[PDB]
């Protein structure tokens, strides 16, 4: 890769300098030298691994929702290859950022992974990227990304609910997003829902173990639980 | 709209 | 070019769906694409190109301000070589798509362009390009990247006075951006008040000669005047 | 900051 010949630490720094400057692709560029070291990454580092891809492929992700929009309105009753060609330019881009992360994961993080802060946090990643890319899938092979999006998350759900606390971050916002491919990819609304109500029920009733400052950090994620029930119900 | 997390910006 | 197989229309599509999905960096591109169809481009396509490629390097040179900002701090009073090459990365990144914007302009937009409204917009660009790579520049050649930035907004200037009204919007953005420039590169403050002012009080008294769509141009840009002379005194 | 056109965004 690119980054082979730059040390790890120095890769970190400057993860941490592109995030100051808001440079997310260079981000995602010095996290993926890191982990192609081979090491396993602190928790830290998986928190900058996570938040410079999803900067870049939220980025891809929103242009692709502006593009395909166009496109729906251009094919309605009542402009050429334009519109579709530039939509599947931005969809063959973001397919090969979901592509390059669950490479990552796939070789070799999770693999490796064998605390459960490390291996539920992976494997919502897996859910996440394999639920971007079914975001835009259409063809034979859209059941089977879905799919793959789903046996990620049910594996993380299940390793979170036997060994991390309710109020856990993780568990948290692994919960939140997978009641969202529930809601919005698999056509569940009420699986959605439901998971997204226990798991806000059984983290109030955890608050009081916590320090406040993990009661501050869990209840932020509570309050999106809580903000799409608003929404969904 | 919804929310899931992380959150880009 | 990797735009040389697309239709010139095409390009300019592209260019106005990428604008529309916030996908700066693509903008650019399809804007330098059809720049080398060789035709000259009408005044939605001269816009169109100087806001691509401003997203593109006012990113670019905010990031390089944060980065340099850390450097500064690194070598005060009381890390290794990562803040110094990274904000190398940038810099060199940033004066290559200042070189590539005057390149266009040099081959051949300037040499083209006859009419008052186009042959100042272009020697605006190139003193705002010029003025740019001066923002990072250090060696033997810094007095000669502001004189080219000095020359290129004082051809403009000339042009501007005598083909113009005051009230014209580019004659107006000109003139904000030499004023910017003679106040912090030149290091100019009393020329660039003057220059705000002279072209504010000026715009002001031909106002009267606009329509309502005319005025609300003008005036948006003389607000800009205004609030750079209320931040200088 | 002082202002300059275009501006970004
Ligand atoms: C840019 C990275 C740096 C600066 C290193 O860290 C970002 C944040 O990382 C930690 O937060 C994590 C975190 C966020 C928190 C909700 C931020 O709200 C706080 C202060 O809790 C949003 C980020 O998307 C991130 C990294 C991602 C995730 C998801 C990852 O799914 C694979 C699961 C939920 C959540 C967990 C992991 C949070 O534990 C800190 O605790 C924060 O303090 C700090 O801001
Ligand atoms: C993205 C491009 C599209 C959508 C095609 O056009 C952007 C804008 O282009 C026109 O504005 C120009 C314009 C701006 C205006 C101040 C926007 O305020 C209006 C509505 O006046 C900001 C843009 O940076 C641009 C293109 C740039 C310049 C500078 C160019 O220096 C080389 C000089 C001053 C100014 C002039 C040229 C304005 O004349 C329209 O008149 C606007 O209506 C429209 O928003
Ligand atoms: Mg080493
Ligand atoms: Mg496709
Ligand atoms: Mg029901
Ligand atoms: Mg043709
Ligand atoms: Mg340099
Ligand atoms: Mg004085």
Same sequence: chains 1, 3.
């Avoid at chain 1, 941490?16 to 440079?23: C, D, G, I, V």
């Avoid at chain 1, 891809?60 to 309105?73: C, D, F, G, M, T």
């Avoid at chain 1, 789903?150 to 979170?160: G, L, N, P, T, V």
Wanted: glycine share 6%; with cysteine; proline share 2%.
């Amino acid at each position: 890769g690119a980054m082979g010949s730059m040390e790890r630490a120095s890769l970190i720094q400057k993860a941490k300098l592109a995030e100051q400057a808001e440079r997310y692709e260079d981000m995602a560029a010095f996290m993926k030298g890191a982990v192609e070291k081979g090491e396993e990454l602190s928790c830290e580092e998986r928190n900058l691994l996570s938040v410079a891809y999803k900067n870049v492929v939220g980025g891809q992700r929103a242009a692709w929702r502006v593009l395909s929009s166009i496109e729906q309105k251009s094919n309605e009753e009542g402009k050429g290859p334009e519109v579709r060609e530039y939509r599947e330019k931005v969809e063959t881009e973001l397919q090969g950022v979901c592509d390059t992360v669950l490479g990552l994961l796939d070789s070799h993080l999770i693999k490796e992974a064998g605390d459960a802060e490390s291996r539920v946090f992976y494997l919502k990643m897996k859910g996440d990227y394999y639920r971007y890319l079914a975001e835009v899938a259409t063809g034979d092979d859209k059941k089977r990304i879905i799919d793959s999006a789903r046996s990620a998350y049910q594996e993380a759900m299940d390793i979170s609910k036997k060994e991390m606390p309710p109020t856990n971050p993780i568990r948290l916002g692994l919960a939140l997003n997978f009641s969202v491919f529930h809601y919005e990819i698999a056509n569940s609304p009420e699986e959605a829902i439901s998971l997204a109500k226990t798991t806000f029920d059984e983290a109030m009733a955890d608050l009081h173990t916590l320090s406040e400052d993990s009661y501050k950090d869990s209840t932020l994620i509570m309050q999106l639980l809580r903000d799409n029930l608003t929404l969904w119900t | 709209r919804r929310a899931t997390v992380p959150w880009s910006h």
